[PDB]
Curated annotation (Swiss-Prot):
<comment type="subunit">
    <text>Monomer. Homodimer after ligand binding. Interacts predominantly with FGF1 and FGF2, but can also interact with FGF3, FGF4, FGF6, FGF7, FGF8, FGF9, FGF10, FGF17, FGF18 and FGF22 (in vitro). Ligand specificity is determined by tissue-specific expression of isoforms, and differences in the third Ig-like domain are crucial for ligand specificity. Isoform 1 has high affinity for FGF1 and FGF2, but low affinity for FGF7. Isoform 3 has high affinity for FGF1 and FGF7, and has much higher affinity for FGF7 than isoform 1 (in vitro).</text>
</comment>
<comment type="function">
    <text>Tyrosine-protein kinase that acts as a cell-surface receptor for fibroblast growth factors and plays an essential role in the regulation of cell proliferation, differentiation, migration and apoptosis, and in the regulation of embryonic development. Required for normal embryonic patterning, trophoblast function, limb bud development, lung morphogenesis, osteogenesis and skin development. Plays an essential role in the regulation of osteoblast differentiation, proliferation and apoptosis, and is required for normal skeleton development.</text>
</comment>
<feature type="active site" description="Proton acceptor">
    <location>
        <position position="151"/>
    </location>
</feature>
<feature type="binding site">
    <location>
        <begin position="100"/>
        <end position="102"/>
    </location>
    <ligand>
        <name>ATP</name>
    </ligand>
</feature>
<feature type="topological domain" description="Cytoplasmic">
    <location>
        <begin position="1"/>
        <end position="291"/>
    </location>
</feature>
<protein>
    <recommendedName>
        <fullName>Fibroblast growth factor receptor 2</fullName>
    </recommendedName>
</protein>
<feature type="binding site">
    <location>
        <position position="52"/>
    </location>
    <ligand>
        <name>ATP</name>
    </ligand>
</feature>
<feature type="domain" description="Protein kinase">
    <location>
        <begin position="16"/>
        <end position="291"/>
    </location>
</feature>
<feature type="modified residue" description="Phosphotyrosine; by autocatalysis">
    <location>
        <position position="182"/>
    </location>
</feature>
<comment type="similarity">
    <text>Belongs to the protein kinase superfamily. Tyr protein kinase family. Fibroblast growth factor receptor subfamily.</text>
</comment>
<feature type="binding site">
    <location>
        <position position="106"/>
    </location>
    <ligand>
        <name>ATP</name>
    </ligand>
</feature>
<feature type="binding site">
    <location>
        <begin position="22"/>
        <end position="30"/>
    </location>
    <ligand>
        <name>ATP</name>
    </ligand>
</feature>
<feature type="modified residue" description="Phosphotyrosine; by autocatalysis">
    <location>
        <position position="181"/>
    </location>
</feature>
<feature type="modified residue" description="Phosphotyrosine; by autocatalysis">
    <location>
        <position position="1"/>
    </location>
</feature>
Length: 291
């Protein structure tokens, strides 16, 4: 029927001017927009924002996933490495969910564009470790709010004008307690190649599962946007993972950083590092690459 009123987050429709699509596709559409007075301390300034909305062919599930995501953003609160929810238009028209605009797009594309020949300038090692640290800080914050993301991956990280990493796409994110444990139907919409064995084999999802996906994200980063498990089709992956198969070291990556990835991929979930442990180790490594 209708969405309950949340005045704390409501933004007036007549102050929002939708602009050009940024993408379109499967779940929903994202559109640039000018929002006048969305920073309340400056009520007459128009700020460039990004608006998520439904497409024409949207389904009931599509709508409830958009609602879901907006709800989750409100609950987790604010962090420098998480995309900022600015407001929503929930009343008397299409659901618009308003986010800060990250100028440089998703990390996967940003990284591929900066591959050495054969905005364009080759990434340095220090840059790749920084990016990694930022994302580990975001995830550390997330875990501490009892939220699992479930869909960590380069395509789901946005990059601002100042090259700040923001974890985005909270469509599938859940409170740790709000998982339907052991049920056949659970975790059926997570990209197989980023997903921990136990999310499929056992139908559970813990922070230790997000750590697995972080490992895959790290490999993505150090390959400058490579596709996980090159040339292994999704249909064969799990039998391989069960057998102990793991991706090889990227070239632009130190033995130490690769050992961290392999740690994130420990078969036993409790044997993987915590996000807190990852943050500490990445700090040490970054502080030392800088000096
Ligand atoms: C299922 C396929 C599909 O729909 N893929 C898809 C979804 C969404 C997008 C949008 C990408 C995007 N987003 C931003 N910025 C942004 C989004 C949000 C919530 N906040 N900021 C920016 C960009 N670009 C800016 C840089 N350009 C060179 C490329 C696009 N893209 C795309 C595909």
């Amino acid at each position: 029927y209708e969405l309950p009123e949340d005045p704390k987050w409501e933004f007036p429709r007549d102050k929002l001017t939708l602009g050009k699509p940024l993408g379109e596709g499967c779940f929903g559409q994202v559109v640039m927009a000018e929002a006048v007075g969305i920073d309340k301390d400056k009520p007459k300034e128009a700020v460039t924002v990004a608006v998520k909305m439904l497409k024409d062919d949207a389904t009931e599930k599509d709508l409830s996933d958009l609602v879901s995501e907006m709800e989750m953003m409100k609950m987790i609160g604010k962090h420098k490495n998480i995309i900022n929810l600015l407001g929503a238009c929930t009343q008397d028209g299409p659901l618009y969910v308003i986010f800060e605009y990250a100028s440089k797009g998703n990390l996967r594309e940003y990284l591929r564009a900066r591959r050495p020949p054969g905005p364009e300038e080759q990434m340095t090692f220090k840059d790749l470790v920084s990016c990694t640290y930022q994302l580990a800080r975001g995830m550390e914050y997330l875990a501490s709010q009892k939220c699992i993301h479930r869909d960590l991956a380069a395509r789901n990280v946005l990059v601002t004008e100042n090259n700040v990493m923001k974890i985005a796409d909270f469509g599938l994110a859940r409170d740790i307690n709000n998982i339907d444990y052991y049920k056949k139907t659970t975790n059926g919409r997570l990209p197989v190649k980023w997903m921990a064995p136990e999310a499929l084999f056992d139908r559970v999802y813990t922070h230790q599962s997000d750590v697995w996906s972080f490992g895959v994200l790290m490999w993505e980063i150090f390959t400058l946007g490579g596709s996980p498990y090159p040339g292994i089709p999704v249909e064969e992956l799990f039998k391989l993972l069960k057998e102990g198969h793991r991706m090889d070291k990227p070239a632009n990556c130190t033995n130490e950083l690769y050992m961290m990835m392999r740690d994130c991929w420990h078969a036993v979930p409790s044997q993987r590092p915590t996000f807190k442990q990852l943050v500490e180790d990445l700090d040490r490594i970054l502080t030392l690459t800088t000096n």
